[PDB]
Point group: D2
Chain length 264, copies 4
């Protein structure tokens, strides 16, 4: 039988590239989305056309809030994402924690608050609950029926040790996700679940600024003097999920073109 | 003329030693507590006896939850009022030590878990963020000519979290976040000359609620002295980092672990 | 056909790296110091699979002068890179794998130990990288390869130092520095410089059981496959980074 | 009883500040120098004037080369530095590995040049510290327990910025990486003898406007005292639970990005 990957925030950009990369290796893919229903469903369509019954889409707000049905908690919503894989395909072999909100939370001058739950939920708390659910399902599976290549990838940030000015909550949340990578790798090793991180520097940079400014930022990357393509990140995620990487756990791989080696 | 330090979770153990260490250097100290009212008030008494009007106590749950007042009171508001208490009482707040911290297992493998999330993440990460925000807002709001000359924020982190304690995921995640806060705040608050640094104990003031051989077993693994640290062995470092001699240090984490993080299984 | 230079290629991890690269279509220059038999045997196997796809070169990578004026380590390193160019006209990949490893205790010979441990693990890699880079720079842009990659074999565990191994540990620390410095300086020439750090691999029960994942040391392939990936064009945005291949061993504490 | 500190490259700048800081705490200080005899001797004079017999000077090339007397090896020269403390004062409590050469060794465009460069940069920054630590430890081990000092401390002067390497400075950067490894390895091995081994890493200090303005805190390089005071604290008994750690003294400079 065919292995299953759950990719959060899979609709576009890096998540899509990760979903596509995994699909190209033969994985059936559960495509999580929050607001990008159209893009997610379009991606599912493409993948199901190449290979029937190889893609589904699930909607979830991964912010640390209760939602409307008692109210539904984030944990419950995370458990149902993993469950959707089991209900549809009877398994979940790979989890990619990719979904992530990203915007300023300045230290210096119902916003703020919202911001805390959105940024911490998507980047840190939801990944925790998702890993918990993922692990619970593997533990609950009889050893003889388990998959042979369980892999969890956390999308971190190569640059957060050189924090982006005004992005504290985001930076804090990636710090937490790094901790989750290490703690989960240790605790889930007995179940042969590998937990690793991939950290982009600058990838698929949006040109929503003066062209010369866009160019200024990307030119700072020592290698190629440009931001990465989506595939340049996703191919690494795909390798780490492959059985050739089966001795790697608890580690974060920078995919940053040497950007973290720079100084002001 | 007397500088003011806010120390969270100041009632006992490391927080108390930090409060005492800062007080010994001339600081007036605002002693935060959650459940340890007796201990906090006793400590305040001792310090006020040595030096009148050099200690106060404030109560606050630093968990990421709304509390009862009218509208519910958010964590952010509660954090702001901690900083405000220093300004109301002494007209200043020069040092913040994010020490308060909950610490217990949140296993990945087999109502509870949810209060756990808000308690562990609130105390270790979210409250420090809001506390730093409030601290910084008050400095920015103070006219340059009236500002203190040695602003210092110390976050109590963990020297061992890169070698995670089995079953302590949320706690470990939260310290990870606090490390991020240290670095991000240091960069952003540098223009205001607010230094933000971390102190990371390994094993300190270990309590023996286990067979003696097991207790001795844990402490013997520390390469230096084969023992856990005293409270002062940690707090003295916090105090140095707050001193003006350490005024070029910001955004860094100092391990106080007797070489424990150098070990392997 | 692209060319890889693998130092200490005769056995264990170096052999697995040489084999892994060869399986991807690389011609491979197999460096050895004392293991002539093993190196030549490996060359034979590879040349049998694919004619003219393997050669062997001998060099002491210790920081000493050797007999011919005496020959310096730098010269010896330059000749290793040169051997690739003389034979195949190119050198696309360099894997700094050769490494001596033994106690240099601080608490109760020592001088050859310093030159051996520091030379193989740090100084020779530096000279090798220098020579490698010089040859790429000297090649006209239109004739250059499209996937230049240098991999340094580091150690996942050296931040948790092995008791009594100071010089070795120092040397890996230097090799890590080399990885970062070289990655930055050679970026304009599109030469990627990265590190792979094993924890416990191909151990010659108590020790291996401490590895959280699988409770065993790794196989050679479990390390070499990662080296091979980093050399592939799919990894072309990775430079200046070290990848631990340690089954979570560096996450442990006493 | 008067404790003794050996400070390498003690003649000027940070080393001098470290020597002065330690002396101000009551230490007798052995001032190592290579080429700066005048400055070293002038510093010794000042310190001996404040407190008779509290300073001496010793000359040594800490480069990884043999010198003229059989030729004298670096190891021997390092052992004699530690020995000089014992001969003069009967003890050596603190070692500060401060001496360091620092200049470009470019990977991209004189063969003898590059070779003395290797031995000079690696010797001073890494190999000599190793031998110095070895000698230092040997002397403590050889001292009967009842006669040992109570606050043994070795400080290695590292670099806060080497993870963001200075372009063209490979050998130097490699050597600091080695010194970091030495700090960690020595801390572990020498823990049983209660010898603490730590690192201090400046970012930009006592620079000889564009460069200094990049430091987030104060937008300037540090003073010598802003670094040396930290070295002094780490050697104090209040820091006696700190070992195997590197303290950045960089005004947040390592937090920056291009
Ligand atoms: N791009 C870079 O240069 C860069 C650099 C460093 C690290 N990274 C990391 O790499 C990963 C992917 O990068 P990216 O640029 O592709 O990310 P992105 O486009 O900014 O976000 C990816 C997806 O996350 C989902 N998301 C955001 N908030 C959510 C929430 N509260 N609940 C549920 N889903 C939410 C969104 O889904 P919907 O659209 O469906 O709403 C979005 O499509 C992220 O984890 C990021 O932190 C990226
Ligand atoms: N001790 C060690 O071996 C060790 C090791 C590594 C790191 N650390 C770090 O060093 C710091 C102090 O260590 P410690 O052992 O002295 O800590 P601790 O005794 O376990 O906790 C300190 C105080 O934190 C307060 N606290 C806990 N949860 C709170 C909440 N939800 N809201 C408000 N206050 C809360 C408690 O105050 P009340 O008693 O008033 O309720 C407690 O007295 C901590 O940040 C810890 O993470 C310690
Ligand atoms: N094995 C592990 O558990 C482990 C763990 C961490 C890191 N590593 C790293 O991974 C790499 C390979 O590991 P390994 O176990 O395969 O290494 P290894 O067997 O101990 O050594 C590999 C080769 O290095 C060569 N070599 C040693 N000293 C030399 C010198 N002075 N001049 C020239 N060549 C010299 C030897 O070549 P000859 O036989 O021809 O003389 C030897 O075959 C090393 O860099 C090591 O540091 C390995
Ligand atoms: N200054 C900074 O911005 C900065 C930044 C990062 C790290 N650091 C570190 O902090 C330490 C001190 O900094 P600094 O700027 O004061 O250093 P420095 O002035 O450049 O050098 C200090 C001393 O090292 C000695 N020295 C150099 N090569 C030697 C050799 N081959 N043998 C014996 N002695 C040798 C010299 O002694 P003589 O004059 O007697 O010949 C020199 O006075 C160094 O370890 C450095 O790496 C400094
Ligand atoms: C108002 O709009 C603008 O013009 C601003 C865009 C943000 N700005 C940047 O400099 C900036 C810094 C880092 C960036 N990245 C690292 C790219 C990027 C893009 N999307 C992301 N998404 C997530 N979730 N996480 C990331 N780290 C992430 N990162 C992008 C822009 C300032 C200008
Ligand atoms: C029942 O079996 C279990 O599940 C194990 C969990 C950990 N156990 C400990 O005894 C224990 C006690 C103290 C420890 N420390 C690291 C000391 C300590 C004590 N209080 C603290 N408080 C806070 N806030 N943060 C800390 N890092 C902290 N650390 C570690 C393990 C019991 C064994
Ligand atoms: C000739 O050497 C000797 O005198 C022996 C002394 C006792 N040894 C070990 O117990 C020991 C400890 C750790 C080991 N490993 C972590 C495996 C290993 C085996 N070979 C290696 N070779 C190199 N070059 N580098 C390594 N890190 C390396 N690592 C292996 C043996 C080392 C071998
Ligand atoms: C012979 O030397 C030369 O060729 C010059 C070339 C131009 N230089 C600089 O721009 C430069 C770059 C960085 C600097 N610093 C980070 C300050 C500094 C000054 N002296 C030092 N000395 C040592 N030993 N180590 C250091 N890290 C060190 N650092 C100083 C000057 C260095 C001096």
């Amino acid at each position: 039988t065919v292995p299953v990957a759950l990719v959060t925030g899979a609709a576009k950009r890096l998540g899509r590239s990760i979903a596509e990369g995994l699909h190209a290796e033969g994985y059936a893919v559960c495509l999580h989305y929050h607001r990008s229903a159209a893009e997610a469903n379009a991606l599912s369509a493409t993948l199901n056309a190449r290979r029937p019954n190889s893609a589904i889409t699930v909607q979830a707000d991964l912010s640390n809030v209760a939602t409307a049905p008692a109210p539904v908690t984030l944990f419950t919503r995370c458990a149902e994402l993993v469950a959707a894989c089991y209900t549809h395909w009877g398994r979940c072999d790979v989890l990619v924690n990719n979904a992530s909100s990203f915007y300023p939370t300045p230290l210096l001058r119902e916003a703020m608050e919202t911001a805390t739950a959105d940024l911490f939920g998507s980047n840190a708390i939801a990944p925790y609950f998702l890993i918990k659910a993922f692990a619970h399902r593997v533990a609950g599976t009889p050893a003889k029926h388990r998959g042979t290549n369980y892999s969890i990838i956390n999308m971190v940030d190569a640059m957060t040790n050189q924090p982006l000015l005004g992005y504290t909550i985001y930076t804090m949340a990636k710090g937490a996700l790094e901790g989750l990578t290490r703690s989960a790798a240790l605790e889930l090793a007995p179940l042969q679940i590998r937990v690793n991180g991939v950290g982009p520097g600058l990838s698929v940079l949006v040109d929503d600024m003066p062209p010369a400014v866009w160019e200024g930022h990307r030119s700072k990357v020592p290698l190629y003097q440009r931001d990465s393509s989506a595939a340049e990140v996703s191919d690494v995620v795909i390798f780490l999920c492959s059985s050739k990487a089966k001795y790697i756990t608890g580690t974060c791989v920078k995919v940053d073109g040497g950007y973290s080696l720079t100084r002001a």
